[PDB]
């Protein structure tokens, strides 16, 4: 069910689906600028202090 939901991801405000069905996404290195070569798993997690 999680695998299926990873495909139904609604786009953002610009119509782009930022996260693919593997849960990964292409990120850009904010220091150099070149995009990171491989897709990296991104998402939202509950973090405590």
């Amino acid at each position: 069910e999680l695998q299926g939901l990873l495909s139904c991801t609604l786009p953002n405000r610009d119509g782009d689906v930022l996260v693919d069905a593997d849960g990964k996404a292409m990120l850009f290195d904010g220091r150099s600028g070149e995009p990171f070569p491989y897709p990296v798993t991104v998402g939202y997690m509950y973090i405590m202090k």
Binding site: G23, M45, I47
Partner: protein, 147 residues
């Protein structure tokens, strides 16, 4: 002699001023010479005032005070008692301990500027970067599913 509500105090600042009757034995030769020359034998005290501990600062929130002149319950020989409450707004910092719900704990090594942070295609930067090598060997895959 009490700090004022709302004041900002730092390490070593005085919160409540207190003076204690000074023991005659510990009078240094210089103090003895002065008290014998001028004869100022009036209201002899020493500084035992409350101070702020090391590594502690913040805004003073409230002050509660109980006196013996006013009818309050205090232990034997205690004339006055004053509590001062100090609050601090602690932002997240290096070395502070974060953790998820799956046993994945960690302290904060570096907080990068929002530009140094890797960002998605539309420019949304990530908020926290968890290393990969930690995940598979602890046997908490629930964090990946939660993500």
């Amino acid at each position: 002699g009490i700090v004022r509500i709302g004041a900002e105090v730092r390490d070593g600042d005085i919160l409540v001023g207190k003076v204690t009757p000074k023991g005659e034995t510990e009078l240094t030769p210089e103090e003895r010479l002065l008290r014998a020359i001028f004869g100022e034998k009036a209201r002899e005290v020493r500084d035992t005032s409350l101070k702020v501990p090391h590594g502690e600062s913040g805004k003073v929130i409230g002050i509660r005070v109980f006196s013996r002149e006013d009818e309050d319950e205090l232990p034997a020989g205690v004339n006055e008692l004053v509590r001062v409450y100090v609050a601090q707004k602690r932002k997240i910092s290096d070395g502070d301990k974060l953790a998820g719900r799956h046993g994945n704990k960690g302290v904060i090594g570096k907080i990068l500027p929002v530009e140094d942070m890797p960002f998605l295609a539309d420019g949304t930067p990530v908020d926290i970067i968890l290393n990969t090598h930690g995940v598979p060997r602890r046997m908490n895959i629930g964090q990946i599913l939660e993500t």
